[PDB]
Amino acid sequence: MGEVVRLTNSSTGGPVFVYVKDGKIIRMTPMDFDDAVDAPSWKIEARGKTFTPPRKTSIAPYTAGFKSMIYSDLRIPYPMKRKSFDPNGERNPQLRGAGLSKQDPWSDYERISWDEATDIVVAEINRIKHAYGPSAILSTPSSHHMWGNVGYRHSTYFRFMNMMGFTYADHNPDSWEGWHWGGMHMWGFSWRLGNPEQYDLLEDGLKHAEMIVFWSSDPETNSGIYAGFESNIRRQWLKDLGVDFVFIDPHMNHTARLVADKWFSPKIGTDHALSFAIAYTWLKEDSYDKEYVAANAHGFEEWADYVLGKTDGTPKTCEWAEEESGVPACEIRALARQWAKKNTYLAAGGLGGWGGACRASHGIEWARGMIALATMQGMGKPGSNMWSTTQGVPLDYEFYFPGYAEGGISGDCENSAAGFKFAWRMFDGKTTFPSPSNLNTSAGQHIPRLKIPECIMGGKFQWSGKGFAGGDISHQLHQYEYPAPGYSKIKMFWKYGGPHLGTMTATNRYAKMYTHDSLEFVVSQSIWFEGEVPFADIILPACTNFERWDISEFANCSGYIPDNYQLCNHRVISLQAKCIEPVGESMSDYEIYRLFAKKLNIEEMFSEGKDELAWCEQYFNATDMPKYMTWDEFFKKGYFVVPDNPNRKKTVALRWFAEGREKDTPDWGPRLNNQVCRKGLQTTTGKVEFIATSLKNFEEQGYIDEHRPSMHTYVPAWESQKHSPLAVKYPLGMLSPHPRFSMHTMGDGKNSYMNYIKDHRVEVDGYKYWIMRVNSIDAEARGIKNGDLIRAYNDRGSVILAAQVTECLQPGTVHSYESCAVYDPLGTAGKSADRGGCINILTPDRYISKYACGMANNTALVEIEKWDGDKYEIY
Amino acid sequence: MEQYYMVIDVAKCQDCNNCFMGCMDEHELNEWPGYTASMQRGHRWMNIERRERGTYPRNDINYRPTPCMHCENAPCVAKGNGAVYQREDGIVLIDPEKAKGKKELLDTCPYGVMYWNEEENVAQKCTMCAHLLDDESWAPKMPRCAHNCGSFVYEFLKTTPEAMAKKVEEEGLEVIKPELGTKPRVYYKNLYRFEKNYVTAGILVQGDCFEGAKVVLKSGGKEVASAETNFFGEFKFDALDNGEYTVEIDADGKSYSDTVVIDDKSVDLGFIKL
Numbered sequence A: 001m002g003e004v005v006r007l008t009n010s011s012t013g014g015p016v017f018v019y020v021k022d023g024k025i026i027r028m029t030p031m032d033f034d035d036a037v038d039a040p041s042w043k044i045e046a047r048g049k050t051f052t053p054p055r056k057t058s059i060a061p062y063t064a065g066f067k068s069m070i071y072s073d074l075r076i077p078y079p080m081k082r083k084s085f086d087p088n089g090e091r092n093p094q095l096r097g098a099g100l101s102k103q104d105p106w107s108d109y110e111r112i113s114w115d116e117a118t119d120i121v122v123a124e125i126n127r128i129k130h131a132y133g134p135s136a137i138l139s140t141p142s143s144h145h146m147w148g149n150v151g152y153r154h155s156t157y158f159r160f161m162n163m164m165g166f167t168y169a170d171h172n173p174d175s176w177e178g179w180h181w182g183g184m185h186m187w188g189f190s191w192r193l194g195n196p197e198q199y200d201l202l203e204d205g206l207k208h209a210e211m212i213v214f215w216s217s218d219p220e221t222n223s224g225i226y227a228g229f230e231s232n233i234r235r236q237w238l239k240d241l242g243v244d245f246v247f248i249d250p251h252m253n254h255t256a257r258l259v260a261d262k263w264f265s266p267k268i269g270t271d272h273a274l275s276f277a278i279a280y281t282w283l284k285e286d287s288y289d290k291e292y293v294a295a296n297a298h299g300f301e302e303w304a305d306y307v308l309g310k311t312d313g314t315p316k317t318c319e320w321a322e323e324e325s326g327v328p329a330c331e332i333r334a335l336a337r338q339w340a341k342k343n344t345y346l347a348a349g350g351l352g353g354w355g356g357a358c359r360a361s362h363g364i365e366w367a368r369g370m371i372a373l374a375t376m377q378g379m380g381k382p383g384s385n386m387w388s389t390t391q392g393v394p395l396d397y398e399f400y401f402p403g404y405a406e407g408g409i410s411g412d413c414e415n416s417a418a419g420f421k422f423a424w425r426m427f428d429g430k431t432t433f434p435s436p437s438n439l440n441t442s443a444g445q446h447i448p449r450l451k452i453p454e455c456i457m458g459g460k461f462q463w464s465g466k467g468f469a470g471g472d473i474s475h476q477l478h479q480y481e482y483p484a485p486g487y488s489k490i491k492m493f494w495k496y497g498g499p500h501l502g503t504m505t506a507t508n509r510y511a512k513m514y515t516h517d518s519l520e521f522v523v524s525q526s527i528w529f530e531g532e533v534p535f536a537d538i539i540l541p542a543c544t545n546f547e548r549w550d551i552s553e554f555a556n557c558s559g560y561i562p563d564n565y566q567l568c569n570h571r572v573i574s575l576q577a578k579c580i581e582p583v584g585e586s587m588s589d590y591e592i593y594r595l596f597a598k599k600l601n602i603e604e605m606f607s608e609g610k611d612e613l614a615w616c617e618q619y620f621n622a623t624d625m626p627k628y629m630t631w632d633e634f635f636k637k638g639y640f641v642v643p644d645n646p647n648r649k650k651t652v653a654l655r656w657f658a659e660g661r662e663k664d665t666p667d668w669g670p671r672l673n674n675q676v677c678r679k680g681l682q683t684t685t686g687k688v689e690f691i692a693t694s695l696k697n698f699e700e701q702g703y704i705d706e707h708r709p710s711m712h713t714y715v716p717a718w719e720s721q722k723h724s725p726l727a728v729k730y731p732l733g734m735l736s737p738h739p740r741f742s743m744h745t746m747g748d749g750k751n752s753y754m755n756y757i758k759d760h761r762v763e764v765d766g767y768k769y770w771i772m773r774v775n776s777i778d779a780e781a782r783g784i785k786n787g788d789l790i791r792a793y794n795d796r797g798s799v800i801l802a803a804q805v806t807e808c809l810q811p812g813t814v815h816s817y818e819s820c821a822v823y824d825p826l827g828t829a830g831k832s833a834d835r836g837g838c839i840n841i842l843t844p845d846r847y848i849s850k851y852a853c854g855m856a857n858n859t860a861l862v863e864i865e866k867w868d869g870d871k872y873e874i875y
Numbered sequence B: 001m002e003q004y005y006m007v008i009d010v011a012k013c014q015d016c017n018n019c020f021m022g023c024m025d026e027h028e029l030n031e032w033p034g035y036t037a038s039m040q041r042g043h044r045w046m047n048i049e050r051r052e053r054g055t056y057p058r059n060d061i062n063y064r065p066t067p068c069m070h071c072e073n074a075p076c077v078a079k080g081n082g083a084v085y086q087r088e089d090g091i092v093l094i095d096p097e098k099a100k101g102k103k104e105l106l107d108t109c110p111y112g113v114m115y116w117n118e119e120e121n122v123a124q125k126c127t128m129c130a131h132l133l134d135d136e137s138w139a140p141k142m143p144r145c146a147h148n149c150g151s152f153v154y155e156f157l158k159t160t161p162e163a164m165a166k167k168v169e170e171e172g173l174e175v176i177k178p179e180l181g182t183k184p185r186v187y188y189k190n191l192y193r194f195e196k197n198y199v200t201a202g203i204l205v206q207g208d209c210f211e212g213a214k215v216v217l218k219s220g221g222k223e224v225a226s227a228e229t230n231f232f233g234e235f236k237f238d239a240l241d242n243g244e245y246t247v248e249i250d251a252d253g254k255s256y257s258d259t260v261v262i263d264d265k266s267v268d269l270g271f272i273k274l
Ligand SMILES: Nc1nc2c(c(=O)[nH]1)N[C@H]1C(S)=C(S)[C@@H](COP(=O)(O)OP(=O)(O)OC[C@H]3O[C@@H](n4cnc5c(=O)[nH]c(N)nc54)[C@H](O)[C@@H]3O)O[C@H]1N2
Pocket: A060, A175, A215, A216, A217, A218, A221, A222, A223, A224, A225, A226, A248, A249, A250, A251, A253, A266, A268, A269, A270, A271, A349, A350, A351, A354, A355, A356, A357, A358, A360, A735, A737, A738, A739, A740, A741, A742, A743, A744, A819, A858
């Protein structure tokens, strides 16, 4: 009926140009810059060359095929109601997921209007509040959300929920685990949940790098986060400069498969054995920065004695490490000597921190081991630092534009990074106001996301820390209980999405909690009918960001990751145009909340009379954008490439710390009161503490925790092959990192195009099965061949997978990505084998340590065999 | 009469599948009158081949994105009975309507790039988004794969046969199944990664990795390759044709030598303790 129009929008996989015609999306593509209106790119001269990025953006796989998710047939059609659910009669809690238990989820629901769906939900809210109170209403979205700042969970969700309830199931620091619960005590960086600063490292690396050690790092796959393939050319440059790339990862990951000069496959949970043997070598050969350490380390003398085996009678030799990890002694020693004599950067994780190794049972020692190595080599000095090659791009750190983590329209200073700068800019205390929460706070009531099942089915729990404990090193040490004093047990559960079966730990328990009679009501506000959604009583259809207006910046998260847009080659700010009308009877989360506000008699206070677009303009004017172009002009253009700032003086990460001077980078910390004349790290001594003073106080106060000693030591992983009694029955070591062709659950299932990718899922007799990589020697020993359906199992459950026999795993180790979007039980829900591919049904739910309340997923012992077709309803 | 050509660098494929997700985005929910009816889920106009070589721990893997070869001497054009035609720019296209009801078309392909669409009852395959190349409005002026890449694998160009031939020789470009004589206009760079094999090992002197050892590869008795071991004591001779070879190693005056058989498989000699 009309012509094609090029619009703009973005995603978690990068910004895109969207072509529309007659209300239909025709295609989505990477973005090309128009040099007539888009500012020039930065340039870096190093080792005789000139390095400048391509005048173009890049996208991730899951974004390239995103159109198939938007128009998915698993896309929730309209509000739905569980047939067996009667608000005023038999609620039949025990029938939640009944359809799923008979392999027909859809038949459990019937269609209802929006007016009725909300009428029902409102009646439950008001009943529960007046009888038990706002705390009786549990709710939680999850870690990731559809791209869009104004509509991100930190913004729209919090702004509405803070006005209605509620008990928040605060999120465990999943991505940071090890750095958060362990590394933090060693070097601070709480405002980054234990991760390191990365500013201006690209130019420093190009000028000085000779070697880079990628440890639990796969940049090509993870891109750090949200950055498509922006850094791919940077490693190309380093490669062509003669820099050696070494990979240490149980699985020969994708970055390694592309540019590895050497690959090591340590057994799961044994990395810290390698780092101890590397430090041992440095000590025996005097091959480390002694001067650096004398000035910046604390308790090094004692730590040194342990590494040498004086205090425990076991020198941490390369041979000792070989027997632990399977990695050849000579190669560990060779790497150590090369590392010492070369300008080596430690790429721990794919962001500069993180790394699957941190959320494993050895996650705490690995993170501290990483800090140890980097420290001994003098991080901060030219050609020596912790850098994963994904951040450090010379972008304009001075230009300010909010990340989603800064709260958007909620202004929640307690649960978003709004308190740092954006809150002050967005609200004026006159015409527009924030939405605080007097419950989602420490003295209020929240529960750990990782232990929701025990709280609902058990009615009680006690733990350490509240969600992201980034305020200070010791905030995570504070003790909480459930129910919180004076507050009520959970009666209702308002879910935003439903991915926990594939994303948490020992997930069968999450399927079981839904039928507990304590749960009076379960609402589900999601986009696709999958995962946990088929357990709800009421289902509300939410739309993707391509069906609403918003605004954002390429990969800009901010908050606990200050200035992370440095992951990109450019700072691209784009208007996320509403390209098409909401699909089916779905609506945006903000319009859903606006309808409830009207019903709860708080419409004015919640919306302030604004639609999503009006909030966008207000958001716009609270940034630095106006300095370059008005709202109108920006709306018209669709995107803006931030100009380069050639002059600003460079401040390399941690260099100020290496040189014993005041902190000069744009980092959000440490806070003044955590430093003596703003020098040194956030730790007490201002030094890297090998014997953490925070933990030493904790343990002397009575909190004894054997798996989290004050001194970084070799604590055997409690879920490893040689230290767990469990290995007798389950001899195979499993690690389950993030999905290659999906942003966690957003990409997999849903009948998307990604399901046809050879290395993503395998079709066998009409059904596309999840993949588990097995080493040829282990497969042969079990009669397993490529493409065979196998059963992965242990005491937690059974998962049906298609086998991929490969060499990219040391014999004895198996690999399978996590974040499966499809939960499809062969028998009763939560009690039988899954064939959807939820590998997390098999991961350990035990906290990393007694007081380290994080997930230890990447260290899981399992056993495999050809599947005899049984449903194994024994859980 | 300038023609279209596509160059793929195997050493650069990382198998992220942006290409493939590229056709699907362009062809699964869309119809392009004159070029092709919507694509059938499951087809791989863009097929990325995967091949692992060697054995743990000195193994490796390489990928080969395989769209339609659009060869100069297209067999299915010669045997398609008018159901397939070659344009002046070199693009080989299946006539969406004339090809309907003919399963046999598929067998005329030496490469196996066409797929049968059940619902449409017609063979389908790579069109090199001719529908996009023919439109000025499409600024990129290149197929969806190439434009979707984030690894700089593709080099899409429109030039003369003289220019392309010169380039083929300067970069050593090659084609799949050259012996068939169809003359594909899709060339591969570093194709040896995918089609050939290697022999590797690690040299140790007195318990430690020995760097700088001199290694020589021989066939028939004459040197075919030489190299010095890196700091891990390893060497690697790739792009090897099937056959028997002799590896001679010299370190610290200490000599070692052994034979190796290459039969469509790469070999890892393990640790050589000198
Ligand atoms: N395609 C895609 N990209 C993503 C995501 C996604 O879901 N899909 N997730 C995004 C998010 S939330 C984040 S937080 C970042 C995280 O970035 P990372 O934490 O780096 O992501 P992981 O996928 O866990 O990558 C860990 C890498 O470490 C290896 N590894 C795992 N356990 C161990 C271990 O014990 N020892 C060693 N030596 N190596 C180990 C794995 O094989 C894997 O390749 O990724 C982001 N990028």
